[PDB]
């Protein structure tokens, strides 16, 4: 296929190496993905007198820059611009450069033309397998096997039509993402101009907002001025809407980085911007009429992230190619026996000089072209297709289909605490640390300072209907104090006679910083002066150094209140003295962190989802390994790990990094019962003795000093404590490099960095493309369902390979022996034989798996002693039956009369014809029945009712023919009535062959289980 592309180029044109005028340029696909394609360069007039060489590959445009690099380059974007450029940028001023940019950056058209059934089908039909199949159909047409050729051609057309229709089913999703052309109000040439969505190009200025139609962000925009609240659920999978801030406040000295500043200031295209805070009229700048925040465009077209994911849907996926090392080795192994059979036929035929040797070479070719390709290319695609069709019914959907066969061999599964296990609804127990000991004081008795610190230090937001939505950790907080939040960003206490607080800046949750700081100012009593008071919150360990004064019982109360299982969160509050207006915004956010005053600890109840315990036990019972990854306190993570039996040992030992340099790390348990330093030996001894947990601080320490130790210890670790998203992705990496197929199930934006990199990943919504697998259902049982469907697909694939190998070999050698005896099947006989093949295979694909997965591990692929050995042993057992029945029929059939043959005479009936045909169909049935790997992985055969009926009809037909109860029946099929003395021995050897094949197969299975 791909290697067949260059022939058309070589015939049509002579390739060019002088860059003077290249009629065409071949495109390197890169080994990762892509296909070799031919793109014609485009000649564009240069307004400044400069020529440009450019082309479009996979809807991504590259261009030629000979000025410095002297090579093609992908198109540069405003992404790398200095942070000061945007603030003074006023938009494009003249229109000649508007066309210039639209040509040399790419119009914002990500829409693709609908692919017709004819076009996709035509592309599919050129694949090497289908061409070889049409060639063998022609060969049967040469051998005057008309009906068999017709049936095979019909079957190939049917299966290819089925696959092409399934591929066409993806068009529904492709246009379901629903990027459409709509009117947009934009700024250009020093005036506000509504401009079409598709023609918006990088560099422009557009006034986005909440449309009355709830429309979507057209393309990636950079929020110039104003605050707005955005729901990234469609893209990021997070139910909680996140905050996006203006860029006017930030200093021009910084360097813009999406990887560092995506979550805060850039609105990703196609994301729900629900309410915008129009910037104050006092500030001088761009004045949008629509009162929507002014937003500069960074990327358009398939250069945006949504466009990138859509390109992944269409072409980015490997598209479950049937071509594999497995398929090639299978064909080679089958072709060895097919070639041997053809060679024996040829030698026997040439042993007779009378017989025409042209037809014997034809017969050799017909044998070879019969045995090898029969329904192989469909199988691995169809197994995945069936699994995915079933798996979509569970209200879980997938984007990359080829990942399902990966899910069968998931040796280690990792989970995120705050997601599945920690559940959605949370209730805050109260504010702790205010009184002696770990006792939580009630909200009534906490200081009013705690009220203001809790109330302000939040990311929440008001919407027009009046609902209050945001982080549950904040919902519980604000319900605890019970102060109302108004649309004007003013907090009015319900029953407390205190002045409201005005929120000025809201620094948001920085996961690497593990914190969140808030600045608000309250009017002094009896005066008009504004006193700015800073309130923060975050993980207590990182806030420790930020406190100016710390109670001595800090660490002890922390540990005690964590051990119960409730998540803790420290607070802060600082007077700041009096601050005037200029440094109210000028004072950098990273200056509010130091010199803090304790106000309290807060604990929110974290219920488990009940489903999690059962599913974790289920996964552990299926020869898996569940490891938790989350960023919370090691004590809390280890407690919830014990409760769900992530760790089953008696003791749980954390690792803590040494405070003093030159000191080794030493393990410590939750109770402190056992303390032991790390050893240069293996961690198997410790893993057996007790459960292991390694924290992010130790993660970084061991990462810096000696990576080998951490690499060898990561598998042994059950609880991953205090890990930031970068470190989570790192843990996934080191699990995957050691050879373990990793399943991770997380949801947060902290999890996007890890789900993509993992072997199989699922993202859960409290349809999305954040991860390869996404389920609308918020439960955790999706992991078990995916694992079972993957094991089902793997088992189906392997059993189908064994089935077709043995069936094709049986047919091969049967036709071979007939040819030696100068007889061949009729057209009608091989037609019905293949028809019964088609029925049984179509019925065995449409099969159901069991509800509960079992301790055994399904075989990853055919590359095991079991498959090869069972095919060889089963085939020997059936081939001896071929030989014996053949020899009996030959030694007991009358000799041939005339040496000459008649071309018009074909399939002249004979007893040898009858014996080998009936025997062949019985043997086909025998292998379908024998090689059905039923329980524990697939439902029991008598439960498989359609297959039971199919095999029953087949065996009834064989019984009816062998007895020949209806003479007109066998007369239609052209079989001769056999004497009973022969029928008995036929049935005897047939049944003995079946039974001894069963015994050989199951004995091999038992001794190599």
From Swiss-Prot:
Enzyme Commission no: 7.4.2.-
In which organism is this protein found? Answer: Homo sapiens
Determine the domain of life of the protein's source.
Eukaryota
Q: Which reaction does it catalyse?
A: [protein]-with a C-terminal TM segment(out) + ATP + H2O = [protein]-with a C-terminal TM segment(in) + ADP + phosphate + H(+)
Q: Which residues form the active site?
A: 416
Q: Where is this region: N-domain?
A: 426-607
Q: How does the protein's chain sit in the membrane according to the entry?
A: Multi-pass membrane protein
Q: Which residues are glycosylated?
A: 170, 303
Q: Where is this region: P-domain?
A: 395-424, 610-766, 767-778
Task: Supply the name of the protein.
Answer: Endoplasmic reticulum transmembrane helix translocase
Looking at the UniProt record for this protein, which Gene Ontology cellular component terms does it annotate, in alphabetical order?
endoplasmic reticulum membrane; membrane
- In Pfam terms, one family for this protein is E1-E2_ATPase
The residues forming a coiled coil are none
Highest classification ranks of the organism: Eukaryota, Metazoa, Chordata, Craniata, Vertebrata
Listed binding positions for ATP are 416-418, 509, 567, 632, 747-751
């Amino acid at each position: 296929g791909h290697w067949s592309v260059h022939a058309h180029c070589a015939l049509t044109c002579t390739p060019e190496y002088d860059p003077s005028k290249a009629t065409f340029v071949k495109v390197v696909p890169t080994p990762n993905n892509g296909s070799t394609e031919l793109v014609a360069l485009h000649r564009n007039e240069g307004e400044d007198g400069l020529e440009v060489l450019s082309f479009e590959f996979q809807k991504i445009k590259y261009s030629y820059d000979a000025l410095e690099k002297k090579q093609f380059l992908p198109v540069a974007f405003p992404v790398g611009n200095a942070f000061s450029y945007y603030q003074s940028n006023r938009g494009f001023q003249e229109d000649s450069e508007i066309r210039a940019a639209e040509k040399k950056f790419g119009s914002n058209k990500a829409e693709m033309v609908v692919p017709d059934f004819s076009e996709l089908f035509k592309e599919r039909a050129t694949a090497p397998f289908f061409v070889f199949q049409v060639f063998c159909v022609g060969l049967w047409c040469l051998d005057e096997y008309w009906y068999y050729s017709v049936f095979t051609l019909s079957m190939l057309v049917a299966f290819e039509a089925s696959l092409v229709q399934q591929q066409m089913r993806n068009m529904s999703e492709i246009r379901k993402m629903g990027n459409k052309p709509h009117m947009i109000q934009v700024y250009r040439s020093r005036k506000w101009r509504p401009i079409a969505s598709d023609e918006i190009v990088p560099g422009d200025i557009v006034s986005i907002g909440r449309s009355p139609q709830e429309n979507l962000v057209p393309c990636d925009v950079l929020l110039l001025r104003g605050r707005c609240i955005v729901d990234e659920a469609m893209l990021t999978g997070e139910s909680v809407p996140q905050m996006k801030e203006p860029i006017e406040d930030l200093s021009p000295d910084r360097v813009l980085d999406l990887q560092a500043d995506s979550r805060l200031h850039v609105i990703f295209g196609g994301t729900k911007v629900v309410q915008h805070i129009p910037p104050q009229k006092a500030t001088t700048g761009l004045k949008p009429v629509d009162s929507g925040c002014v937003a500069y465009v960074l990327r358009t077209g398939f250069n945006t992230s949504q466009g990138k994911l859509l390109r992944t849907i269409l072409f980015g996926v490997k598209r479950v190619t049937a071509n594999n090392l497995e398929t090639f080795i299978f064909i080679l192994f089958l072709l060895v026996f097919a070639i041997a059979a053809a060679a024996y036929v040829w030698i026997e035929g040439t042993k007779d000089p009378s017989r025409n040797r042209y037809k014997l070479f034809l017969e050799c070719t017909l044998i070879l072209t019969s045995v090898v390709p029969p329904e192989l290319p469909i199988e691995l695609s169809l197994a995945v297709n069936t699994s995915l069709i079933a798996l979509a019914k569970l209200y879980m959907y997938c984007t990359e289909p080829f990942r399902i066969p990966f899910a069968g061999k998931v040796e280690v599964c990792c989970f995120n605490k705050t997601g599945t296990l920690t559940s959605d609804s949370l209730v805050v127990r109260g504010v702790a640390g205010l009184r002696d000991g770990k006792e939580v004081t009630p909200v009534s008795s906490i200081p009013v300072e705690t009220h203001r610190a809790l109330a302000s230090c939040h990311s929440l937001m008001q919407l027009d209907d009046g609902t209050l939505v945001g982080d549950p950790l904040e919902k519980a907080m604000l319900t605890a104090v019970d102060w109302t939040l108004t649309k004007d960003e003013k907090v009015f206490p319900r029953s407390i006679k205190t002045q409201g607080l005005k929120i000025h800046q809201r620094f948001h949750f920085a996961s690497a910083l593990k914190r969140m700081s808030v600045l608000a100012s309250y009017e002094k009593l009896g005066s008009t002066d504004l006193c700015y008071i800073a309130a923060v919150k975050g993980a207590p360990e990182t806030l420790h150094s930020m406190f100016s004064q710390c109670p001595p019982d800090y660490h002890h109360i922390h540990t005690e209140i964590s051990r119960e299982g409730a998540r803790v969160l420290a607070l802060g509050y600082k007077e700041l003295g009096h601050l005037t207006h200029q440094q109210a915004r000028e004072v950098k956010r990273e200056a509010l962190e130091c010199s803090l005053k304790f106000v309290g600890f807060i604990v929110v109840s974290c219920p488990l989802k009940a489903d999690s315990k059962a599913v974790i036990r289920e996964i552990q019972n299926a020869s898996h390994r569940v490891v938790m990854i989350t960023g919370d306190n090691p004590l809390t993570a280890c407690h919830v790990a014990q409760e769900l039996h992530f760790i089953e040992k008696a003791h749980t030992l954390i690792l803590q990094p040494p405070s003093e340099k030159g000191r080794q790390c030493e393990w410590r348990s939750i109770d402190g019962s056992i303390v032991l330093p790390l050893a240069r030996g293996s961690p198997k001894a410790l893993a057996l003795e007790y459960a292991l947990c390694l924290t992010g601080d130790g993660l970084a320490h061991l990462q810096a000093t000696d990576p080998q130790q951490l690499l060898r210890l990561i598998p042994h670790v059950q609880v991953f404590a205090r890990v930031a998203p970068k470190q989570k992705e790192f843990v996934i990496t080191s699990l995957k490099e050691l050879g373990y197929v990793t399943l991770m199930c997380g949801d947060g934006t902290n999890d996007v960095g890890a789900l993509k990199h993992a072997d199989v990943g699922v993202a859960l919504l409290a349809a999305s493309i954040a991860a390869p697998f996404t389920s609308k259902l918020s439960s955790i049982q999706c992991i078990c369902h995916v694992i079972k469907q993957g094991r089902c697909t793997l088992v189906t694939t392997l059993q189908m390979f064994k089935i077709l190998a043995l069936n094709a070999l049986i047919l091969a050698y049967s036709q071979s022996v007939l040819y030696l005896e100068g007889v061949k099947f009729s057209d009608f006989q091989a037609t019905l034989q293949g028809l019964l093949l088609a029925g049984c295979f179509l019925f065995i694909s449409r099969s159901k798996p069991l509800k509960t997965l079992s301790r055994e591990r399904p075989l990853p692929n055919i590359f095991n002693l079991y498959t090869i050995l069972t095919v060889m042993l089963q085939f020997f057992v059936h081939f001896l039956s071929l030989v014996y029945l053949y020899r009996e029929a030959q030694a007991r059939s009358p000799e041939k009369q005339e040496q000459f043959v008649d071309l018009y005479k074909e399939f002249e009936p004979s007893l040898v014809n009858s014996t080998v045909y009936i025997m062949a169909m019985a043997m086909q049935m025998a292998t379908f029945a024998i090689n059905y790997k039923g329980p524990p992985f697939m439902e029991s055969l008598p439960e498989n009712k359609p297959l039971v009926w199919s095999l029953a009809v087949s065996l009834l037909a064989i019984i009816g023919l062998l007895l020949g109860s209806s003479p007109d029946f066998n007369s239609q099929f052209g079989l001769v009535d056999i004497p009973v003395e022969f029928k008995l021995v036929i049935a005897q050897v047939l049944l003995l062959d079946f039974c001894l094949a069963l015994l050989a197969d199951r004995v091999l299975q038992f001794f190599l289980g």
